[PDB]
Amino acid sequence: RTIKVFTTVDNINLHTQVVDMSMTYGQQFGPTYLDGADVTKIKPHNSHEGKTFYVLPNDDTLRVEAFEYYHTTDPSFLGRYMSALNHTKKWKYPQVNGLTSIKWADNNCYLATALLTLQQIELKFNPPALQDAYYRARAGEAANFCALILAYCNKTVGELGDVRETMSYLFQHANLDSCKRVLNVVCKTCGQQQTTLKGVEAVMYMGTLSYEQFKKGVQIPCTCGKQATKYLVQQESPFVMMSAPPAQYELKHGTFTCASEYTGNYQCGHYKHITSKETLYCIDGALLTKSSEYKGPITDVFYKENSYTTTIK
């Protein structure tokens, strides 16, 4: 007694299977999922005929398909993706000021601000999984994209992540190869030291939120025990992300693209998103407020860029 089903790792390439309806999916395929639901311990029902089940990439055909689609060989990746999807499928993705947001659930505030940020910066993903899911998220169906971020970042639904760390992981899977940064560190004692950064390290800085201050210079520790000055010589990138420990900061309309605000304590706080459009909009999941001025505990600010060369000699 049998039905026909299809197994997959990428939901595109299907593998015809004939399953014994007296045995679990588990006994025939190993761990098995139906649109995120774990059916490993369940026996085939007739309503399953012709349906697609996810399985683990446990032969060379599935390994090649999984790597080509996801760009990861982490063995627990597919199970993490399916477990998250089972939750993200039931989140709400309301359109807020023309952007896909996420209604608050399960500490997902860091994800909502990350998703809102992506839709305001020029970025293309390398893994087809992220390309296809990000296209759907932009159209309003973000369940797959959210599940993939959770899986790539090794975060479970319910865990509060850091926005900067999350953007860092997503940038590693994006085409930032054109991006270039040149830095100069001046110590009165020790003189000068020029650094070039490439890719992800060229678009991220930790220590100040102000793109203008980065250009004029910021004080950092030197090994000699003095304070050295670091400023921006040259930048080629479509955006920059300036990050700092959360601290009261004033966001001025028209001077930035968007920003992330973090309120509260370590691992038990809340992120909000601020976008600079015709005014300052504060997007907090499904919630929207406006103001002409904004002050809060800002962690990250995104700025547009193309090409910058310092006048500092």
| 284 is annotated as an active-site residue | yes
Return the one option of ligand L30, Cl ion, Zn ion, none that residue 247 interacts with (CB less than 5 to 8 A, by type): none
> If you ran DSSP here, which 8-state letter would residue 60 be given?
H
Q: Which of 106, 132, 284, 300 is catalytic?
A: 284
Site of interaction with Cl ion (CB under 5 A):
124-125, 131, 134
* Distance from the Cα of residue 245 to its chain's centroid: 19
Per CB under 5 A, the list member of 42, 187, 218, 286 interacting with Zn ion is 187
Tracing tokens 């004939």 back to the chain, one arrives at: 18
Binding of residue 224 to Zn ion (CB under 5 A): yes
| 109 is annotated as an active-site residue | yes
Which CB, 190 or 247, lies closer to ligand L30? 247
Binding of residue 227 to Zn ion (CB under 5 A): no
* Distance from the Cα of residue 189 to its chain's centroid: 41
For residues 153 to 172, the per-residue mask of contacts with ligand L30, x marking binding by CB under 6 A and - elsewhere, is -------x-x----------
The dihedral over CA atoms of 168, 155, 85, 288, expressed in degrees to the nearest 10, equals -70
Binding of residue 220 to Zn ion (CB under 5 A): no
Binding of residue 297 to ligand L30 (CB under 6 A): no
Return the one option of Cl ion, Zn ion, ligand L30, none that residue 190 interacts with (CB less than 5 to 8 A, by type): Zn ion
Q: Give exposure, 221-255, as e/b (b: 16+ Cβ within 10 Å).
A: ebeeeeebebbbbebebebbbbbbebeebebeeee
Return the one option of ligand L30, Cl ion, Zn ion, none that residue 189 interacts with (CB less than 5 to 8 A, by type): Zn ion
> If you ran DSSP here, which 8-state letter would residue 45 be given?
P
Residues 253-272 close enough to bind ligand L30 by CB under 6 A:
262, 266-267, 269
Cβ count within 10 A of residue 97: 14
Amino acid type, 235: Q
Phi, psi for residue 31 in degrees, rounded to 5: -55, 130
Q: Applying CB under 5 A, which residues contact Zn ion?
A: 187, 189-190, 222, 224
Query: Rule CB under 6 A: which residues touch ligand L30?
Result: 160, 162, 245, 262, 266-267, 269, 299
Show binding-site residues.
187, 190, 222, 224
Q: Which residues are annotated as a binding site for Zn(2+)?
A: 187, 190, 222, 224
